[PDB]
Amino acid sequence: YVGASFVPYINWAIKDAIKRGYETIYFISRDGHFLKQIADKIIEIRGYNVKTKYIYGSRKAWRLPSFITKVDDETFWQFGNFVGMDSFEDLVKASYLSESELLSLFPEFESLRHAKHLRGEIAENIRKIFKNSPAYHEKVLAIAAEKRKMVRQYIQQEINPKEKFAFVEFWGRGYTQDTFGRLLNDAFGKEVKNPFYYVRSFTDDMGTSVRHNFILAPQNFSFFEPIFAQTPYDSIPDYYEEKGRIEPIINHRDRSVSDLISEGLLKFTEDYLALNTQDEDYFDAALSQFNYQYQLNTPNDQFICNVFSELKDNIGVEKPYAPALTLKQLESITSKQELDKLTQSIPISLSKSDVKVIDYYNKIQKNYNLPAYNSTPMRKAYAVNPLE
Amino acid sequence: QYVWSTQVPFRVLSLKQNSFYLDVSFAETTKRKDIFLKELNEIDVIAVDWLKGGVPRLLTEHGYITAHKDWVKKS
Amino acid sequence: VDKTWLFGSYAWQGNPKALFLYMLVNCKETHECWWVADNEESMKSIKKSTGLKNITFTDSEKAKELFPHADVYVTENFRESYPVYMNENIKVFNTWHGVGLKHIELALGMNSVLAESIVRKYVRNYDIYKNNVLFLTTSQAMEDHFLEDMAISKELIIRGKYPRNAVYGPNGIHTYDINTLLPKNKSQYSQTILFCPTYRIGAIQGVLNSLLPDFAKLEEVCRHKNQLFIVKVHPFMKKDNYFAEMSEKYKDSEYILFWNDDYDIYEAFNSIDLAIIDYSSIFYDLLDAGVEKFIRYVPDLDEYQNDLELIGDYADLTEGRIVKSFQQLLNCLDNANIKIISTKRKQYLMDYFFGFKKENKSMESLIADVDNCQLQPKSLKELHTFDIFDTLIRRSTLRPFSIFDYVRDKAKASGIKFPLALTENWINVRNRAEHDVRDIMRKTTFERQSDKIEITLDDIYTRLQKNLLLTDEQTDFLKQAEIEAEIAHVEPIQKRINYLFSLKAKGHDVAMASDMYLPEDVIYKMLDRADTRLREIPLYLSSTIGYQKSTGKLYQHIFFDLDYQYSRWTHYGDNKHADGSVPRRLGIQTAVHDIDDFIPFENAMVNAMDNYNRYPAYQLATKMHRYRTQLVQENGFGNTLFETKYYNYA
Ligand SMILES: [Zn+2]
C-alpha cells in the first residue's frame, strides 16, 4: 500500500526533475524522510545524475520569520493562525505574543479566559481585531526579524544557491512554500525561483513559487499524513546554534514503525523498478491513479483498517487516526465536533466497529446530524483467522 | 393514454383539478402550491417535453401539467 | 360600510397596527378594517391580548373572502408573498418601518448578505411593487432616498406622518396600561430612560456586554436617582446568552426593566423622558413622538460609521449628548440634567426627516390621500432565460465525453507524438483536470479577493501543460481540436429555439444563461451553427462573468445587471439543480425538462468499446436514440409499433 502510494510518485518526480534540468532535490522535514530514502534508492538503482539533500523545517519554524516587510493577511483568514483555537492558551500561542504581552495590546482580550471553544464568528472577530492593530503588526515584525536570523543562516549554510535546485513535498495548499520562498529571497538577496514537487497542491504558481503536481485531479492527500507522522522525531519547532553552526531542534520518537515502513518501501522500490514495463511513466501514472482512488474510497479494506487507521497521529497526543468505536463513546456524543474528536474518518472507524455500534450510530445520526454511513463492516481477506 | 400534439401551441380543457409542476419529474418539491389549473378551465399548451422514459408533459405559461387523458382533453 | 382595508405584517407592530386601531376607532362608518396575521397563533394572541374581533389570518376562509374584493392592503414592508387571490386593483399602502440614512432594498446590491431574499421578493412581486404600492414618504429628503433605493412609482407616493408616532399620544390609543408592566407607576420615578441599542458588526463580547458590562452599578445609580431604566434591544441581540442572564437576574428589579416585546414600545413613547440611542432608526421615531432628551451612547462610532456607507453624516442628522464610555454614561445618569433639543436643532432634524408633517397633515388626511388615489398601471414585459447545452442545442454524439474521444482519436492520428498517459487516458486526464481547476478556483477565493469561481478552457489546458510538461504545439493541437469538435458536433433543438423566437416576437425579452468554460466567441459560433438567429440573442456565459447558475450567483448578476422591470421570470433548462432548485430559490419560475440519454442497449454498446471503437459506437447509439425519439415523439406511434420498429432496426 505505502509503496504504491509513495514510490511511483517519487519516480515520476525524479524523472521530471532530470527533464527540467534540476541538479539538486531537497526533501523537507518529516514528509521528506521516507521520500528521500525512496529517491536515494531509485537514483542508486537507475544510476540517475542528480543529488539529493535533506532540509529540516516546518510551518511553525518558517511562517513567523517569513514576515519580512508585512504580516500575511492569510494569518487572519479561514486558514490562518487563529483557526482551531479551543482555549485562551491557543489564542495567545496563535498570536505569537506572550499572554501579558498580548493583554497589553488588547485589554479587551482579558475577558477571553476559559472560552470552551474559540471558533466561529468569535474567531472571525478575533482575526479582524488582530488585523486592525498596526502596533501588533510592528511587534510581530520585530519578533519575526529576530527569529529570522537563525533561519537565514540555516538556509545560507544548507542550500547552494548557484545550483539549479528543486524541493519535493507531498501535499499542501502552497502557502508554506510561499513563506519559504520569501525566506529564500531574504537569505540570498535576489528573486530565487523555488519549485516544489507535490502529489497535488491547490494554489497556482505565485511569484517565485513554482508547483509541479503529479496528479491533476481534485483529490485530498492529507489522508496520508498519518504515515509521515511515523517519522522518528517530532515536527521541527525551531532552530538553535552550537559550534557556530545552525541546527534543527530534533526531539526524537521511537524508530520501530518507521523502521518497518522503510523496509517495506525499499523492498517495493526494488520490486517496482524491476517490472517489465513498456512505458514506465505510464505505469507510474496508472498505478498511482488506481492506488489513490482505491485508498481514498475503500474505508472497509483489511489493511487500511487494521494498520493505517491504527497509526498514532498527534494532529494533540499519540492517539490512533480512526479507531473502532464503542457504544458508550457514541452515547457520549451529541454533535459532529465531539465525534471528530474521537476519529478522523467516521467510515473507517465504523467499518471497524461492532454491528451494534453501527446500528446505534445509524439510529442517532439522522437526529444528531452526523454523516451517513454508506459502507459495510471490514472482512479480512488473508490471514483471516488468528494464526496463534 | 396521453394527450399531446406535434403542433404547438394548442388548447386543452382541464377535466379534473390539475396541478402545475416546474419540473417534468413532477416531484413534490417542484409542484406549485400557490395556484392550480381550475377544473373545466381551458389553457394553451406551448410545448411538449418528454421524460427519458417516453412520457409527455404539457407545458403552460404557469408550469407543466399532465398529459394523461383522464386529466386533460384537447379542445 | 363602503371601503375595505386589511393590515398585514409578520408581527403585531408598526404603522399597520397603529392605523388599524385608529381606523377601527375613528373610521368605523366609512371603512371596514381587518388585520391578517401570518398564522392562527398570531390571531389568537392578538385577540387574547386586545379583545378585538376583526382579526383573521392568512389563507383563512375569512381572508379568502376579504382579499378578493378589498380596497387597501396596509403593510410595513415589501412582503415576500402576497395572496394569489388578492384583487387586481388593490392599493398596497406600504407605510415603511422607519426613516434614516442607511441604504436599503435594491441599493444593497449583489454583495449584500440579503441578496437572495431581495431577488426573490422582486422577481416574484415586481408587478405589485410597481403598479399597486403607494409608498409613504415623510420628507423630500426621505422621498428622494427611498425612490433611489427602491422601485416604487413616483406617481403613487403618499406624503404624511408615521401613524405609529402620532396615534398613541397622551389622549390617543393604548392597547395596554403601561403601569401594569412597570415595578412602580411611572409617577413614582424621577425619570424614565429608554435604552435602544442596535445590533453591531461584531465583537468578542455581546453588544449588551460591551455597552453595559456592569448591570449592578447601573442598578445602583438608577436607584440613587430613582430612575426607571428600560432595556430595549434589537431582536438579534436577544439571542445572546448574556441578554437572558441579565434579564432573568433583574426580573423583579425596581429600577431595571427588560422590556417585554409582546407590548408595542411605541405606545409608551409619550412616557419616555430620556432616550439613550445609537444607530437605530427608532431615534427619529422618538423625535417624532415628542421625546426631547437624547444621549448618543456611541462608543464604537469609528467601527460603524467608517464601515457602512451612509447617505449623510451621523452626528449632523442625529441628536443627543455624545458619550463613548460606560463610566461617563454612569457619570451622566448620576450627575447630569440632559437638556431638551434646542428648538432650532429640532426644526432642522424634523424638517430633514419628517418635513411633510408641517403640511397640516393628519391621519384622516392620509386615509383621504390613499382612498382618493388612482392606479394608472402599465402592462410590463416578461423575461425568459434559456439554458444552452441540452436545452437550445445538443451534440451529434449526445454525451459530452464523446467530444474528448473524438479529440483523442485525432491526437493519436495527427503524427504529433504525445505522452501515452495523455492519449490512451485522455477522457479521465482532461475531465479530472477540469475538476481540478474548478476546485482550485473554489479554494482560492481569498487569494484572488473574488467570489467568482468559474474556470476557462485556457485554465484547464494551462494546468495540463505546466504539469505534464507539454509543448505549445501539443497543447494548442488538443485545445483547437476540442473547440472545432464542439463546434462540428452542434445540432439545434429546433422546437425550443422556435419557441424562444416566438416569445421574442410576442414582445417579451429573452436571453441565454449558460454555465460553460468555453470562450464566448466559441459559444456564439456553436449557436450560429445551430441557428444563425441565435447570434443576435443576449448571452450570459459563466466563463465571461465568473458567476454560475449552480451557485445562483449568475441569476443575481442577471437581476442586478438588467434594468429589471419584468412581471415574471421564467428559465428553461435541463438541470434539476442549476436550472431548477437554485433559480426557484430566487423566485424564478422554472421549466426543467429531461436531458437526452441512452437506454440499456445503447449504453451497453458504448461501454463495451475500447478507444478504437468508442466514437463510432457513440454515433450509432445516438442514431438509435434519435430513431426511437422520432418514432415516439415525432411520428406518434403506439407502444407495439415503436417497439417492433426499434427492435428490427437496432
Ligand atoms: Zn444544459
Numbering used by the authors:
A (entry chain B): 650 to 964, 968 to 1040
B (entry chain A): 1041 to 1115
C (entry chain A): 0 to 649
From the paper:
The X-ray crystal structure of the capsule polymerase Bcs3 reveals a multi-enzyme machine adopting a basket-like shape that creates a protected environment for the synthesis of the complex Hib polymer. Supported by biochemical studies and comprehensive 2D nuclear magnetic resonance, our data explain how the ribofuranosyltransferase CriT, the phosphatase CrpP, the ribitol-phosphate transferase CroT and a polymer-binding domain function as a unique multi-enzyme assembly. CroT transfers ribitol-phosphate from CDP-ribitol, generating a phosphodiester bond with the 3-OH of the nonreducing end ribose of the Hib polymer.
The CMP binding pocket on the C-terminal side of the interdomain crevice is defined by α-helices α8, α15 and α16, loops 1–3 of the CroT-CT domain, as well as loop 4 of the CroT-NT domain. In Bcs3-CMP, a corresponding pocket contains two phosphate groups (PO41 and PO42), is located at one end of the β-sheet, and is surrounded by α-helices α37, α38, α45 and α46, and the loops shown in Fig. 2. Structural comparison of the CriT-CAT domain with PRTases revealed that the 5-phosphate of PRPP superimposes well with PO42, whereas the β-phosphate of PRPP superimposes well with PO41. In agreement with that, a phosphate and a Zn2+ found in CrpP’s deep pocket superimpose well with substrates and Mg2+ identified in structural homologs. A structural comparison of the CroT-CMP complex with the TagFH444N-CDP-glycerol complex (PDB code 3L7K14) revealed that the CMP moieties of both structures superimpose well.
